[PDB]
Amino acid sequence: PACMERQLEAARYRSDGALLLGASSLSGRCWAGSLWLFKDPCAAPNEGFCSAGVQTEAGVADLTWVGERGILVASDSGAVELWELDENETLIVSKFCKYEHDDIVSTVSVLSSGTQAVSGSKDICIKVWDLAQQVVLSSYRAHAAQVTCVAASPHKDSVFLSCSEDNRILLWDTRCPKPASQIGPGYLPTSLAWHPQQSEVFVFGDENGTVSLVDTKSTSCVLSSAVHSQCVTGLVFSPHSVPFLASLSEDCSLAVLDSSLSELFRSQAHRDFVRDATWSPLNHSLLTTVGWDHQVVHHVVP
């Protein structure tokens, strides 16, 4: 807990109002990882005000909440590990660190129920976890290049998405004998996020700054906009009943998108890669962004 490493990777608001900073060191002598829990995320990222934090063996590519005290972390090494937050909200304890992948873990995400997990590593294979029993239930080598993202279905426990650098976008199901389902020669997709309300809409952001909105069973590119001039790193819908879509790219720019992909907000607050965002579980006008300029800039969105 000496100092939070220079590079922020992921940030996720907990339901109770706390912040979960993922931060790895991508430069310098030691390339190590470190999680961070803030009960007053405004005080971040000043380590002196962190209610919790811990080191790992290597870098944190993406992390997720599992329940209220769990933590899903994907090391650069290729092993997903589960860090049960201690009941005091003061210490972070490793539970397992299963060396399962053969190369960098690039995404993780929890199925809708909250009992299983999926990860995707530049070893093209995607896996599925059982967090209670702590082994892999299924190891599908579906794509043909690295897996760029995954997004678990908020409403169906057996549905998740995953785009690749081999231009495939696959809607998946844990039941079917053949689980993959290619659901669109364009620009390479780079991020996915299911719609929180109309559960059969999902949006893939491409490598050229064009947010899309594709229907699984229709596959007509419905509504897309070149909001960013560089790779769309992440998309995260808002908690409003009619939610907005946050759009942060390698350009160091963040915007909010509607159902018509009409720009609401555009912030250049970050002076390097904006790496992931989240909305306030308390103040729905309040958004938190974390980037590789080590800043955590709080945005008030219209």
Partner: protein
Amino acid sequence: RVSSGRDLNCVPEIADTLGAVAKQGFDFLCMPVFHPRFKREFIQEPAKNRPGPQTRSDLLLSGRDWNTLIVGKLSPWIRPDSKVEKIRRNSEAAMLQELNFGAYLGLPAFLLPLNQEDNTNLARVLTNHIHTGHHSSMFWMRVPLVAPEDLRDDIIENAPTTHTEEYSGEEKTWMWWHNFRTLCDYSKRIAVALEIGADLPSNHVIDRWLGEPIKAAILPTSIFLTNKKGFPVLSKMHQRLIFRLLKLEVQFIITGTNHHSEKEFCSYLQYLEYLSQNRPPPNAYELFAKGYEDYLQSPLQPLMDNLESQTYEVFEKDPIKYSQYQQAIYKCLLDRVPEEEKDTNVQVLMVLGAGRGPLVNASLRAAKQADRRIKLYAVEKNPNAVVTLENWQFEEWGSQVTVVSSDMREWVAPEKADIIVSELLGSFADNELSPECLDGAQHFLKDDGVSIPGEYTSFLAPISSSKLYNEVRACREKDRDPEAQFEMPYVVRLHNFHQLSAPQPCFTFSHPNRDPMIDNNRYCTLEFPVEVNTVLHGFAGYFETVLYQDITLSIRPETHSPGMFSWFPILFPIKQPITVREGQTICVRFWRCSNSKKVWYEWAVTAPVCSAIHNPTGRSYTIGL
């Protein structure tokens, strides 16, 4: 032992990690030099200005550790052939960065992937880096045997793979590498790192990748089976491949995570060492030839130079040629003189080209074997070796042996000869003026003499070889034709190549030539059915012989005489690669031209393409009479 190093993608502490691998027994380490997920933009602010540093300090290891242990990796995000213009330009800049930092650190090799067909910009950036500054990193262009898009499990319910016969659809990967290499112009600083997937391709393809400068085979820990005791082993065919590569002295790399959680990770490298120990022993020939693989040697001038004593000495340790010569002489002596005249009929040999004495000693041994009385001569052009023959003749041989100091073609013999043991066979069985020399020697061979050898043949087999082509290509010298290194035969222990077909008889010589019109000029048309997409970089030559009725000598690999190191093969290059498509027929032609003064061979390919008549008039390589 065979080198072997761990491929990593997680090195939090460089010193700790390298220490751990060294304890595990690895020799080197393949690591990323800039962090893998550290996407650095070189074009537009404000990302263009992320304050440094950029990577681990140069000083974390000493120049010696950097130079001898580590092997760099080109970051995954770098994609200099992506379609997006921005990503193309960013990747160009990043790849230049990473390669230059690798050369600065000193790394002894750099790992670059070939994971798609469109690799032209990558080849361009890499060649521009090969031509900037003086550095000695070598580039291992990781390329899998079977593409990812064909290794995948059939789980896409809506776009299943085309499982039907796709012959070259199974060879797409070698073509990927072939295009990359040809763009980068066969640079001797680009070499392959053949990934080994769980399922191998057919036999022909795995013959393909040999001849390709494979510098390291990359074995994932996903292909190691589990044995009943709980440790990894490799199936019989994987072991076959691994033994081939072991012959090729590659450096094996264990990439991937540990899949045997019961046992620590070193078991894999223990298994590689186990297999290397158990590999079938090298034979008598290969033992001698080691230290000689793919090393081109300019052939000998038979009549213009005098062989120096090291050469005679080293070629007098051959275990088979002299046994064969003794046996042949024994049989011929028995044949020519029956039992009853074994005391009245005296047979006069004349060893032509006696050297330092080995044929004459063998001839005397055979005369004693066959209980027949002989009167040897020994014609030996090299006046030095006439010195050694004189010493023998005075000391040991006695009046039994005469010694003549003159050319076989010019000497005037006192009395005619019955047998003539001569050994003037070259690498290619007639490219050392054995025909000419013996044709000038038969004027003193009786009307029923016997000439040993009585015949000898030459053999061609069209080989493909990147290593040997680039060898000939780097055989340039100042002060001569910029393209004559491709027009002369090279004596070489052909090792790293791919014989594309079966050798076929090229030029058959027999002795004596009592044909009324002696003509030593030869023309030959040969067709070699090529049955796999590949390139053709030259025609290799071998030879068989017939000393006496059945006693033979041969270096032709299918019937190679045992442990005969007196002759290596020959390599006739051709001026350019001839991309050949499977099922075609490579057609080649030789003329063995010779005039009053000189000799030479002229070779051309007349199908599927046509190549320049190589060595016309012996402008590149003529054997001086």
